[PDB]
Amino acid sequence: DEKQAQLYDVIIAGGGAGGLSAAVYLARYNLKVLVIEKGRGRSFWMQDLWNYVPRVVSGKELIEGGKEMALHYGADWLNGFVEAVTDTGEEFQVRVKYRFKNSDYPVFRAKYLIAATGLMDVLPQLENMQNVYEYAGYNLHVCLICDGYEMTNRRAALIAGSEKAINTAFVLNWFTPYITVLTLGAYPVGDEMRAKLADHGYPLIEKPIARFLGKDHVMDGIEFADGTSIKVDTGLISMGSIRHDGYLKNLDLLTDGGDIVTEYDCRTSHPRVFALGDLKKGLNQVSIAVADGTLAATAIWKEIRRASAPRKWTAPLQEAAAR
Amino acid sequence: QAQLYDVIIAGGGAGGLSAAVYLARYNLKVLVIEKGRGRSFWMQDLWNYVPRVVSGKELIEGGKEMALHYGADWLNGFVEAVTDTGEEFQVRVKYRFYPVFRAKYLIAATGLMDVLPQLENMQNVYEYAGYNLHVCLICDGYEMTNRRAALIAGSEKAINTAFVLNWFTPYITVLTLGAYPVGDEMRAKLADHGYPLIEKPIARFLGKDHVMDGIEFADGTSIKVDTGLISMGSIRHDGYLKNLDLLTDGGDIVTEYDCRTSHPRVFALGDLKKGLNQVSIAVADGTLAATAIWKEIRRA
Numbered sequence: 137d138e139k140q141a142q143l144y145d146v147i148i149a150g151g152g153a154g155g156l157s158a159a160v161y162l163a164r165y166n167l168k169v170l171v172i173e174k175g176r177g178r179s180f181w182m183q184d185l186w187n188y189v190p191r192v193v194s195g196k197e198l199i200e201g202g203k204e205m206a207l208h209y210g211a212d213w214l215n216g217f218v219e220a221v222t223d224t225g226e227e228f229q230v231r232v233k234y235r236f237k238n239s240d241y242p243v244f245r246a247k248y249l250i251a252a253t254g255l256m257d258v259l260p261q262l263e264n265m266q267n268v269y270e271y272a273g274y275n276l277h278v279c280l281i282c283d284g285y286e287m288t289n290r291r292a293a294l295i296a297g298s299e300k301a302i303n304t305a306f307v308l309n310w311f312t313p314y315i316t317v318l319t320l321g322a323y324p325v326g327d328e329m330r331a332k333l334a335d336h337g338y339p340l341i342e343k344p345i346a347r348f349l350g351k352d353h354v355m356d357g358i359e360f361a362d363g364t365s366i367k368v369d370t371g372l373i374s375m376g377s378i379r380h381d382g383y384l385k386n387l388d389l390l391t392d393g394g395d396i397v398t399e400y401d402c403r404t405s406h407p408r409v410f411a412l413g414d415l416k417k418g419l420n421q422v423s424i425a426v427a428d429g430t431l432a433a434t435a436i437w438k439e440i441r442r443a444s445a446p447r448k449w450t451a452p453l454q455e456a457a458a459r
Numbered sequence: 460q461a462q463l464y465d466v467i468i469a470g471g472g473a474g475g476l477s478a479a480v481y482l483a484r485y486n487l488k489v490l491v492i493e494k495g496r497g498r499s500f501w502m503q504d505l506w507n508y509v510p511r512v513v514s515g516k517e518l519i520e521g522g523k524e525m526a527l528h529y530g531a532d533w534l535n536g537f538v539e540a541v542t543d544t545g546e547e548f549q550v551r552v553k554y555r556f557y558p559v560f561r562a563k564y565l566i567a568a569t570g571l572m573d574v575l576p577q578l579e580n581m582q583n584v585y586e587y588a589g590y591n592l593h594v595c596l597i598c599d600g601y602e603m604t605n606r607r608a609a610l611i612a613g614s615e616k617a618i619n620t621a622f623v624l625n626w627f628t629p630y631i632t633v634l635t636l637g638a639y640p641v642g643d644e645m646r647a648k649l650a651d652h653g654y655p656l657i658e659k660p661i662a663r664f665l666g667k668d669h670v671m672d673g674i675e676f677a678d679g680t681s682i683k684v685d686t687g688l689i690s691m692g693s694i695r696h697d698g699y700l701k702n703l704d705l706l707t708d709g710g711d712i713v714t715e716y717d718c719r720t721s722h723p724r725v726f727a728l729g730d731l732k733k734g735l736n737q738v739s740i741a742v743a744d745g746t747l748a749a750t751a752i753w754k755e756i757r758r759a
């Protein structure tokens with residue numbers, strides 16, 4: 137209730153890897169920052185962050201730990217869903233959906249905006265999605281950079297959401313030649329791509345998936361709608377991404393293929409709004425998002441600091457004055 | 460040694476270790492050469508790298524174990540020289556306090572070392588340096604907030620750091636150690652802001668159990684301080700890159716976004732490249748360089 141009338145220096149939409157880094161930096165610059173996080177984001181479904189020094193942690197540990205740091209240094213935190221943003225010319229107003237049912241819709245104010253809401257991987261749609269979630273993020277992966285190492289020389293299914301996504305096989309084959317391409321029967325494959333799959337020895341299965349097969353979160357097969365199946369040691373879902381960043385529509389941000397175009401310090405085309413991580417154009421890795429938070433937080437602090445009056449040691453000046 | 464590595468990494472701190480984990484997880488053959496006791500080793504608390512505050516010692520030890528676990532090679536040595544034959548890099552290494560290794564790509568990840576004030580007994584400096592006597596303002600300004608702070612400036616130009624430190628604390632004393640004259644304009648500006656200027660040589664840092672609480676000068680007088688910031692510049696010892704005619708700006712190596720330098724197939728990470736000196740930046744640099752390299756190799 138005070139949070140609402142308080143003018144923040146910065147509001148961060150999204151409290152994942154990029155937003156939490158930005159929040160710790162801004163708090164340690166002694167700036168007023170509010171983080172708004174809806175919960176259950178992409179990094180949360182990451183079982184193992186394999187490649188972020190110095191320690192392998194779960195995505196849950198990453199988020200809880202970053203949140204604890206941000207709060208310890210003075211950031212404010214709001215469990216809510218960002219709905220809309222307006223730049224009044226003087227400030228950003230951010231409308232937030234609060235509570236899941238019978239919701240309030242508070243509006244917070246800040247001088248700067250950081251968009252750190254990331255993306256969500258499209259998944260195959262089975263009647264019982266728990267069958268997918270049983271394996272997704274374990275040995276059924278969504279990111280090749282993230283898990284190609286674990287796929288090395290293993291029997292791999294590539295689930296492609298479009299004909300263009302089949303091209304992922306010709307990068308996956310860096311790690312494993314034992315690739316089967318699954319379309320789920322969702323789209324036609326032209327003969328040209330057929331010939332290329334045939335040249336490389338990658339079978340093409342166009343049947344809908346009935347079920348992922350396995351035990352204790354280890355997939356070992358896939359059953360199709362006709363009751364035939366294949367044995368696999370691993371898989372990669374390449375079906376695109378959803379961003380649900382409509383809250384940015386009033387800002388007329390320059391985009392490229394869904395990603396927000398930024399400068400090196402993550403500045404967007406709209407003054408005083410920054411874009412971090414999986415939402416900006418670039419590699420989608422935790423390391424990248426965390427570093428984006430560093431650059432944005434530092435850019436904002438430099439702007440505010442260079443516009444501020446110098447803090448003088450007034451005691452010596454006043455005492456000499458009085459004498 | 461007889462194996463042609465895909466890449467040799469000079470320096471096994473934050474950025475070099477990040478690159479090594481990525482490269483090994485690209486199933487590339489990679490060698491890290493690390494001399495030990497670098498800048499990050501002396502960091503007592505990494506405050507601002509989510510999700511966990513760790514010592515610099517823990518950062519390096521953990522990163523090294525990860526790189527080895529995914530298949531990187533590691534050598535405790537000092538990189539001396541590099542030759543680009545046109546086909547490969549030859550990297551000569553001083554081992555024990557002089558083998559030559561070969562690779563297709565070079566990552567320069569050797570960072571820098573903060574200049575420290577030179578007292579007769581440096582152990583007195585090391586007692587406090589990296590604790591509440593800081594070397595990086597972005598890293599530790601938060602902890603200095605509104606505390607009595609000494610700024611040890613290695614040159615007149617470094618005195619300008621006071622006018623950024625003052626964001627965190629206005630209670631600034633500026634120490635020159637008597638190493639240079641200070642011009643009237645800078646004198647006026649310090650006095651206008653109320654920041655004492657002390658031009659005496661330092662005898663000793665004062666404190667207990669790694670907590671500095673004062674500074675004693677050569678004439679036997681002292682000041683009380685709760686914290687301090689050293690701003691005396693940096694040393695790189697990057698002569699091993701001398702033959703590659705890399706483009707530089709003030710000692711920092713200039714790179715593209717993906718850390719490519721002016722010389723093909725050599726990258727530069729972290730504190731050694733032009734940019735912010737933070738762990739987060741170095742680690743992401745490692746990600747970008749390793750991925751650019753994998754992409755070149757994969758397309759070849």
Ligand SMILES: Cc1cc2nc3c(=O)[nH]c(=O)nc-3n(C[C@H](O)[C@H](O)[C@H](O)COP(=O)(O)OP(=O)(O)OC[C@H]3O[C@@H](n4cnc5c(N)ncnc54)[C@H](O)[C@@H]3O)c2cc1C
Pocket residue numbers: 173174175176178181215216217233234235236256257259269270272273278
């Ligand atoms: C590898 C991977 C593994 C996954 N595993 C699982 C799993 O195991 N179990 C599971 O459930 N999902 C899992 N998912 C997530 C799944 O794909 C969907 O993204 C997810 O189920 C969306 O849930 P949702 O309906 O709440 O959508 P959301 O986008 O989260 O929510 C939809 C609506 O709910 C409201 N809302 C959301 N949050 C708030 C909030 N804090 N406050 C107020 N209102 C809010 C809003 O109106 C919003 O538009 C996984 C995803 C991936 C990539």
Ligand SMILES: Cc1cc2nc3c(=O)[nH]c(=O)nc-3n(C[C@H](O)[C@H](O)[C@H](O)COP(=O)(O)OP(=O)(O)OC[C@H]3O[C@@H](n4cnc5c(N)ncnc54)[C@H](O)[C@@H]3O)c2cc1C
Pocket residue numbers: 149150151152153154155172173174175176177178179180181182183184185186187188216217218219252253254255257272273274277278279282283380383412413414415420421422423425
């Ligand atoms: C299974 C899996 C394994 C992975 N493994 C690795 C790995 O090993 N190494 C690596 O680098 N990367 C890995 N990744 C990718 C990694 O998670 C992302 O690259 C990273 O999380 C990017 O951070 P972000 O901040 O940009 O996005 P996120 O971390 O996802 O955070 C964005 C935040 O925005 C929140 N949010 C979204 N919309 C709203 C809204 N309207 N209102 C409020 N909040 C909102 C979300 O809930 C989320 O918390 C993995 C990803 C997955 C699914």
Ligand SMILES: Cc1cc2nc3c(=O)[nH]c(=O)nc-3n(C[C@H](O)[C@H](O)[C@H](O)COP(=O)(O)OP(=O)(O)OC[C@H]3O[C@@H](n4cnc5c(N)ncnc54)[C@H](O)[C@@H]3O)c2cc1C
Pocket residue numbers: 493494495496498501535536537553554555556572573575585586588589594
């Ligand atoms: C905040 C901070 C705190 C610090 N605290 C301490 C402290 O507590 N104790 C301390 O000693 N220093 C401390 N230092 C470091 C100090 O300032 C010097 O930089 C450091 O001590 C130099 O050690 P060195 O003589 O090995 O020089 P180095 O540069 O490390 O080595 C000099 C020479 O030794 C050879 N050599 C070095 N390493 C190898 C190797 N693995 N194999 C073969 N040959 C090698 C080479 O010919 C090289 O040129 C601290 C520094 C900072 C910034």
Ligand SMILES: Cc1cc2nc3c(=O)[nH]c(=O)nc-3n(C[C@H](O)[C@H](O)[C@H](O)COP(=O)(O)OP(=O)(O)OC[C@H]3O[C@@H](n4cnc5c(N)ncnc54)[C@H](O)[C@@H]3O)c2cc1C
Pocket residue numbers: 469470471472473474475492493494495496497498499500501502503504505506507508536537538539568569570571573588589590593594595598599696699728729730731736737738739741
């Ligand atoms: C006291 C202190 C506290 C700090 N706190 C923070 C913080 O809180 N947050 C933050 O972001 N940053 C902090 N920093 C800065 C941080 O340490 C650097 O930004 C970071 O380490 C940069 O990584 P790097 O890989 O480039 O360099 P480094 O970590 O320094 O690694 C370079 C490596 O190269 C080795 N090496 C150098 N030369 C050679 C050679 N010829 N041959 C072989 N090996 C060589 C070195 O021994 C070293 O290990 C702190 C720094 C200090 C001194």
